[PDB]
Amino acid sequence: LPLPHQRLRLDPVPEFEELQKAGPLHEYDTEKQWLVTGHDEVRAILADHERFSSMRPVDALLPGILQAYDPPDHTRLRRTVAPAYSARRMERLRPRIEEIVEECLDDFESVGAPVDFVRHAAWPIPAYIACEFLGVPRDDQAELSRMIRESRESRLPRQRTLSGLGIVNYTKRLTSGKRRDPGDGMIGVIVREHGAEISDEELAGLAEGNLIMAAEQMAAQLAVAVLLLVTHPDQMALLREKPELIDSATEEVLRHASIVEAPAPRVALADVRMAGRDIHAGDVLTCSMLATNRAPGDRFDITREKATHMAFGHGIHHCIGAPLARLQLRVALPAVVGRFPSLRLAVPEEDLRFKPGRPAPFAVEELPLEW
Numbered sequence: 116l117p118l119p120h121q122r123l124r125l126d127p128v129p130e131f132e133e134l135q136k137a138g139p140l141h142e143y144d145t146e147k148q149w150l151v152t153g154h155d156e157v158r159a160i161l162a163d164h165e166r167f168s169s170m171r172p173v174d175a176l177l178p179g180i181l182q183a184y185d186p187p188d189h190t191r192l193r194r195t196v197a198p199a200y201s202a203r204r205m206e207r208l209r210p211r212i213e214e215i216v217e218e219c220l221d222d223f224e225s226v227g228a229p230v231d232f233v234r235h236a237a238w239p240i241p242a243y244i245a246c247e248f249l250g251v252p253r254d255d256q257a258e259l260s261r262m263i264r265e266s267r268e269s270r271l272p273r274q275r276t277l278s279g280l281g282i283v284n285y286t287k288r289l290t291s292g293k294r295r296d297p298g299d300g301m302i303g304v305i306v307r308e309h310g311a312e313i314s315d316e317e318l319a320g321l322a323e324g325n326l327i328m329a330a331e332q333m334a335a336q337l338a339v340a341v342l343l344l345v346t347h348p349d350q351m352a353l354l355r356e357k358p359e360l361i362d363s364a365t366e367e368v369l370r371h372a373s374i375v376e377a378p379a380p381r382v383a384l385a386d387v388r389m390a391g392r393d394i395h396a397g398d399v400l401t402c403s404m405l406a407t408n409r410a411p412g413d414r415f416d417i418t419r420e421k422a423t424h425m426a427f428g429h430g431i432h433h434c435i436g437a438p439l440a441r442l443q444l445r446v447a448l449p450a451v452v453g454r455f456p457s458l459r460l461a462v463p464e465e466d467l468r469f470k471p472g473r474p475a476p477f478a479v480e481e482l483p484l485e486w
């Protein structure tokens with residue numbers, strides 16, 4: 116496990132904080148490699164798509180996967196897909212999101228004495244929301260959500276592969292279904308508005324990618340946000356009493372959690388001079404989001420003033436689902452602290468297990484909660 120993906124519970128490790136002190140750019144192999152830790156340097160790399168490519172370095176096509184596209188084709192695909200994420204489309208989803216939150220919290224609560232928050236809320240909430248976002252029939256949602264989790268998390272590689280083929284097959288069918296009948300959800304919107312500008316294979320790959328990312332990223336984000344709130348009970352009470360704190364609170368949980376520890380490796384397409392270093396064409400750069408988002412001595416503080424974090428990245432690849440992610444947190448967090456004023460850990464903090472942020476996201480495996 117490379118240094119930029121090591122944690123002590125939620126925190127970067129002291130040896131990584133020490134390397135950050137030495138400078139913004141290090142000769143370090145995460146995957147000639149560079150590890151980028153400087154705030155301005157990370158910004159600069161991510162904004163400079165023309166000199167720093169997102170394509171895997173080779174000496175494999177991923178149709179519809181925006182992260183893997185460089186910005187001739189990235190530009191056309193992104194603007195074909197962007198309308199599905201607009202602020203207006205998002206606000207129209209709000210009612211189903213509130214409904215889903217309440218339903219899943221009802222189910223979580225209905226379980227015996229202590230309950231795992233990951234199993235009963237943190238996975239189900241975003242998984243169901245991702246299905247709605249994609250326009251998945253209500254009756255298929257439980258099935259598909261299980262498949263999503265299992266495809267990303269199963270101890271059994273056979274099972275990940277099986278669940279993964281199941282997802283691919285389901286979204287191909289959903290894609291052709293929505294191509295014929297462009298109704299509710301991301302695929303319908305994209306077909307109605309840019310149907311001519313996109314192939315069935317791009318649309319299907321994009322559907323799968325977005326389904327998996329929306330469910331998985333937010334599951335991790337939601338469970339860590341709640342972990343943070345229950346281990347800081349004062350702040351939980353602040354948010355309950357000052358509900359107008361939700362916006363800076365959602366920024367703080369994104370900043371502090373740093374769910375994506377590093378975006379895709381960037382490949383230099385030209386020689387570049389940066390922070391006193393000679394980057395050569397073909398060098399591979401890892402941007403450390405833990406470096407940029409976290410500082411030694413930082414404490415979780417929902418009243419935090421300015422948010423300069425890069426939890427969603429930066430530049431042309433800046434997380435396109437951000438509006439949906441922020442919306443979920445804005446609904447789910449006030450609902451959680453409102454319904455459960457005495458929410459707390461049911462086990463010692465040292466019992467908690469964390470999935471490392473390589474591959475993304477960093478997550479808490481299990482969150483036994485009380486009251």
Ligand code: HEM
Binds near residue numbers: 330433
């Ligand atoms: C809080 C949860 C999330 C976090 C922290 C997060 C983080 C990120 C980051 C850091 C990137 C940039 C990757 C890169 O530059 O290589 C990204 C891109 C992307 N994300 Fe998110 N994400 C989250 C949730 C979501 C959701 C809910 C969706 C689906 C609606 C989504 C879909 C995407 C897509 C399609 C891209 C690629 C956009 C592009 O490359 O132009 N993510 N995400």
